[PDB]
């Protein structure tokens, strides 16, 4: 969503 694939 907002760190690495997220």
Same mark, same amino acid.
């Given at each position: @969503? @907002? !760190? !690495?694939?997220?």
């Amino acid at each position: @969503k @907002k !760190w !690495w694939k997220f």
